[PDB]
């Protein structure tokens, strides 16, 4: 068959729906997701972060332990240098 203008399979809605049979379903779900109100997030912004306090404590602890190990390494190297001085 003759070659026609190859439709852009990334923006042309008709040809994209032909290629992927579920694209209109996926886009409708995306529209439904995006079409929500803002009060829900306005009142759940804390609720989704205060329940991150346990992870925040854990992260503080782990990075604290990392820096503690680094500081101990610094102190040990300093002591070895003092010994090797004399």
């Amino acid at each position: 068959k003759k070659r026609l203008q190859n439709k852009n399979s990334l923006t042309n809605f008709a040809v994209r729906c032909r290629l992927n049979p579920a694209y209109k379903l996926l886009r409708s779900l995306a529209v439904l997701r995006m079409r929500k109100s803002i009060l829900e997030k306005s009142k759940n912004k804390k609720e989704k972060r205060v329940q991150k306090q346990i992870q925040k404590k854990e992260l503080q602890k782990i990075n604290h332990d990392y820096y503690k190990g680094v500081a101990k390494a610094v102190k040990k190297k300093k002591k070895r240098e003092e010994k090797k001085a004399k």
Partner: protein
């Protein structure tokens, strides 16, 4: 009549088809496989009550007032013939820069908005078009200069379609004369032309 691809809602318009091409094997087919085309639509800040500047016609720089859409994208304008002395001019959006002033924000101008709107729907593109036989009669005299320039003017005056629009413009001017005239600053704003002064800068100046 429209199609809502991705929620654009573009609206459709009937379209004719006249291009003729000899087809591959035997005959000649009409080129336009389609019959409908999305309308033109306009810039966000073009409305009936706005005031604008014509940019290219032989009325260069004159200020004018939007009137009405003509179902063709091309829009009709009235720089009232008794205030700015400008006839009807079915001109385009991208030839017609529009300012940010709406004429109906004025307290005494807002009263004639109803009549201005009711006086618009009568005009149309077939009225604005030029007539074939009148064009022929005009071209006949080309095959003394003062004589020919008077002949052209009187022929266009006697043009049967012209008189309707002439009366329409006379009515618009008569309606809009006194309230606009009472504001000296607005009247001179509409009467004076627009130039470019080297002190100002186009890009950094918002319309």
């Amino acid at each position: 009549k429209h199609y809502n691809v991705k929620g654009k809602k573009k609206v459709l318009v009937p379209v004719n088809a006249k291009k003729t091409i000899n087809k591959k094997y035997f005959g000649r087919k009409v080129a336009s496989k389609k019959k409908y085309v999305v309308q033109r639509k306009l810039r966000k800040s073009i409305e009936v009550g706005k005031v604008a500047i014509i940019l290219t016609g032989k009325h260069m720089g004159k200020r004018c007032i939007i009137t009405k859409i003509l179902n063709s994208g091309l829009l009709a304008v009235v720089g009232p013939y008794e205030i700015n002395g400008v006839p009807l001019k079915r001109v385009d959006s991208r030839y017609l820069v529009v300012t940010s002033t709406n004429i109906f924000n004025f307290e005494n101008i807002a009263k004639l908005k109803d009549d201005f709107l009711n006086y618009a729907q009568d005009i149309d593109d077939d009225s604005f078009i030029k007539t074939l036989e009148i064009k022929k009669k005009q071209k006949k005299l080309l095959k003394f200069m003062n004589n020919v320039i008077d002949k052209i003017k009187e022929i266009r005056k006697e043009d049967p379609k012209v008189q309707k629009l002439e009366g329409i413009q006379k009515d618009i001017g008569s309606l809009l004369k006194p309230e606009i005239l009472k504001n000296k600053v607005f009247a001179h704003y509409l009467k004076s032309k627009f130039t470019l002064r080297n002190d100002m800068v186009l890009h950094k100046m918002k319309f």
